[PDB]
Amino acid sequence: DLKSLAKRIYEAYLKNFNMNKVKARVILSGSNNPPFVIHDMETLCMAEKTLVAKLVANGIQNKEAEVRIFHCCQCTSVETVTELTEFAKAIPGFANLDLNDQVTLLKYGVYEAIFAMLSSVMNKDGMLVAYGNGFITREFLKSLRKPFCDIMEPKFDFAMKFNALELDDSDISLFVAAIICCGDRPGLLNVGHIEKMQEGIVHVLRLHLQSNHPDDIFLFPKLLQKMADLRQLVTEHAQLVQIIKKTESDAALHPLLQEIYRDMY
Numbered sequence: 001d002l003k004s005l006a007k008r009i010y011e012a013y014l015k016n017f018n019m020n021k022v023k024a025r026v027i028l029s030g031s032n033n034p035p036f037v038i039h040d041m042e043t044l045c046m047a048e049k050t051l052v053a054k055l056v057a058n059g060i061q062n063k064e065a066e067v068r069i070f071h072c073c074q075c076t077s078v079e080t081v082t083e084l085t086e087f088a089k090a091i092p093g094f095a096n097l098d099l100n101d102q103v104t105l106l107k108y109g110v111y112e113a114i115f116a117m118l119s120s121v122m123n124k125d126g127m128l129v130a131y132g133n134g135f136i137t138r139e140f141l142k143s144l145r146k147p148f149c150d151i152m153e154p155k156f157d158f159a160m161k162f163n164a165l166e167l168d169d170s171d172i173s174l175f176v177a178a179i180i181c182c183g184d185r186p187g188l189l190n191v192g193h194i195e196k197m198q199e200g201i202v203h204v205l206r207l208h209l210q211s212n213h214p215d216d217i218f219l220f221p222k223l224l225q226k227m228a229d230l231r232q233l234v235t236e237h238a239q240l241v242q243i244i245k246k247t248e249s250d251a252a253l254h255p256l257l258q259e260i261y262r263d264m265y
């Protein structure tokens with residue numbers, strides 16, 4: 001039954017991602033460990049002394065703030081790739097795929113999924129970081145020197161339009177499943193089984209949107225377009241990352257993330 005395929009995907013989403021949209025919009029709105037606001041250099045340094053004490057003692061605050069923010073981004077990406085891999089291992093039919101095709105799907109899918117889910121922790125003024133314990137302002141990131149000021153703003157632009165669709169986690173879980181189970185990734189061995197897998201997920205998504213969002217007549221084709229938008233956003237992101245790896249010393253790539261980008265686009 002498709003009602004339960006959707007429920008299983010949604011339950012695996014709530015289980016595997018440490019931050020979900022309901023939790024995020026609470027923190028983002030107005031407790032015990034409120035988010036420290038990072039809006040200039042002074043507050044970045046204060047936040048680092050509390051949230052990453054070992055690094056400060058290692059002397060990271062001698063490095064350019066842009067380098068520390070980039071490596072903060074990388075650490076968050078590595079953790080999200082780990083969650084996405086477990087989420088996917090929990091997608092019905094994914095674990096039955098060929099080992100090599102699981103790697104291919106995740107390799108090309110993870111950053112599309114990341115930037116989709118990143119919208120959940122963004123508002124027009126900034127984004128949540130450090131497991132809900134920091135809030136870094138969009139204007140502070142815009143204030144960094146090139147090229148680092150170009151990292152986050154295209155993702156804010158995507159997220160504000162994405163958030164206007166007013167999806168909830170039950171929608172987003174299916175959307176991310178669909179991103180991962182994409183039958184036209186380069187390098188796929190058994191394209192036929194993946195397309196049938198994708199067809200079933202997208203079928204559930206289309207049906208779920210019908211019942212969950214009866215007011216938005218074209219929400220399904222809108223989300224198809226967002227999937228294309230995300231692939232272009234990821235292509236452009238990989239280009240900026242390659243610029244940074246080559247031009248900026250100190251901003252070395254984490255080994256897990258380097259393998260993801262290797263031969264990607």
Ligand SMILES: Cc1cccc(Nc2cc(Cl)nc(SCC(=O)O)n2)c1C
Pocket residue numbers: 038044047048051052055060063067068069070071072073075129130134136
């Ligand atoms: C927004 C925020 C919150 C918490 C810590 C930090 N700074 C970081 C975070 C990370 Cl994961 N790494 C670094 S420096 C790593 C290095 O110089 O090798 N600096 C930042 C930039």
Ligand SMILES: Cc1cccc(Nc2cc(Cl)nc(SCC(=O)O)n2)c1C
Pocket residue numbers: 070073074076077078080114118128129151152155241257
């Ligand atoms: C969930 C979350 C919140 C904040 C930042 C990130 N990682 C990002 C986001 C953006 Cl727009 N850019 C980067 S550059 C480092 C990388 O390509 O992994 N890393 C992630 C994955």
